[PDB]
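Exercise 7. Given the components listed, write out the predicted structure of the assembled complex. Treat all entries as one system.
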Amino acid sequence: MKAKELREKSVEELNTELLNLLREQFNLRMQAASGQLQQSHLLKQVRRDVARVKTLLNEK
Amino acid sequence: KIRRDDEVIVLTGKDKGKRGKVKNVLSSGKVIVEGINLVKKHQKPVPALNQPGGIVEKEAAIQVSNVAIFNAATGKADRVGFRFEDGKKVRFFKSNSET
RNA sequence: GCCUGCGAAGGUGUGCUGUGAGGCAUGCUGGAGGUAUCAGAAGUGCGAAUGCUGACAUAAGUAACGAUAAAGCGGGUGAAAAGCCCGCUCGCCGGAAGACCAAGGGUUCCUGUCCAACGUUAAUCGGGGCAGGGUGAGUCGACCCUAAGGCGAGGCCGAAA
RNA sequence: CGUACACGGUGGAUGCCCUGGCAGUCAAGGCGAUGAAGGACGUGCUAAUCUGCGAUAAGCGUCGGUAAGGUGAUAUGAACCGUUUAACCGGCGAUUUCCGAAUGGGGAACCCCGAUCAUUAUCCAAAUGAGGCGAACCGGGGGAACUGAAACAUCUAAGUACCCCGAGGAAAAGAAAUCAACCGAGAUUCCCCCAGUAGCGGCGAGCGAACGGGGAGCAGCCCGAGCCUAAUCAGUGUGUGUGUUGUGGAAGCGUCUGGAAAGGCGCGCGAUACAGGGUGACAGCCCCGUACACAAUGCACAUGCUGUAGCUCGAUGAGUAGGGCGGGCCGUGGUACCUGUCUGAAUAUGGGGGGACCAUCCUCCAAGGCUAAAUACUCUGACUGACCGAUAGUGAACCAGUA
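Answer.
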């Protein structure tokens, strides 16, 4: 997701997204448990996403 | 200057007459062209110099002095490959003096 | 106004010339630049401050390792074992080299793999090097408060920390 | 074991090179309680350092530039991103946990709140100020000694070192009761000269101006009333001359040596652009760059303009002038300035000054106040230097203000 997408989303959409990404921000945490499908791309990307939307939320 | 997106033509080395594209350019001045390779032990198509030893660099180690890109003079060389989105570079490419 | 990778400056050895201070040449090497004339220039040409700094020789392969003075005989492992491990025998210490702790130090603890470095010998040993693991309390300690005493605020003093 | 040399080693000089220093020059110049500087501690898949950030942590967003290569220095392994055009460069915006001058209070970063002084005050901190930092320069005060006088108590070093308070990017001074060659000059600083003269001094050693002149820079005005409107004040609009990056940018030529020329030799060229660096060995004509060109920002000092708004009349400041006592300081001499105690005028039909006192000329008028402009340093950016070269040069060209 890019800043352009988040700005287009509504106040509720950003909330459901932050929450969806929040719920999303759970699935991962399994490497130390011995996982594989865990991707390093979104590891760092997701934290930025929930943040990007968090920044625009205040910009509004 | 020399770029990686260009084709070179040998003129001195035992690979004289071979054609190919520039693999990569090192800050050493040497240039490895797609073609000038060597036959390793287990016969693996990998460019490298001819000398005994353990671990040594790849590339056949060609020199810009014996190569042939766009030399403004009378030679035996012929056509050579060369960006376009620049626009201004297209004018020079169109001129029989530069590229 | 000249020399140079048909090779210079520098260095080593050597030949020649000058009263000399030096110039110059050859061979080896070096292998990058280096001079002569006239002219100007420089923080300019040096062995002798219990001089300053770094390096080094002779001296020396000379001096030294001493109340808890205990090791020894077999065996095991190992390429090597007089001081790694096993058994036996022989001893040391007992307010003490025993047990539990403060301060302080601080992971140095444990396991595995090694040892180039450390252990005033060697080491397959280690409080050594490398990689992991270990210190799971409401009632333990911190956290809290206070004594001698101290600090900040108001009061009062050219001025003020 | 003496001595020379040979081969090898130890060692590290020397020769060359050097991403560093040293020095000069131009430009530019403040930060913060919207809590900065600095420090602490995090942050990249691995990273121990440095740098960048800081928990959206060597990163996020927008615009513009740019460009295909990119993911800091380390060119590693793994791996990611980029044409839904990144990296990189410039500006700006968003965000920016906790502690932290924070000030609620305590405290070696941890736990609970506008602390203290002060003004206004609806006296409710309700509305505000101060409390910090910063290279030097600047202003107002306090104020030595060793030393020199080849002794030393004046003097000299000092009005320096150091200390206290404070402003700005610039301060202080200043419109003359001055100067005094003159029927004249005429606001004040600063530079040069006048002077090392006048003057001071056990007149010993030493100390040491000013007027004027030649320049730089030039601006004059305000405190009772009358009257009326273009000084001033409040506000509005808002620059010419720019900052960084990218675009318009010619150019391996020949022979020889070599692994390679930025060699030797031969030839040609740039120049309102005759710095330097990079590219496999001394390339101004290989690449960047130098003169040059263009676009993004900051500053936009000024000007214009609205409403205010001229101008006119009189006067002009006493514990002051001055005198006495005791000191400081100055080139200050009975003839500098200032502080402390005491005394104490007149008043423009007046008074002060012209380096002695008192009566007579000339000049000018204090005891109230304000005022632009002309030099400093050098953190920062850039450039330069017949400067030094890594036991040289900044202590630091290698982790250094580190071990």
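Discussion: Residues 1, 26-30, 61, 63-65, 71-73, 83, 85-86, 88, 97-98 of chain B lie near RNA strand D (CB under 10 Å from a C1'). Chain B is about 5% helix and 20% strand.
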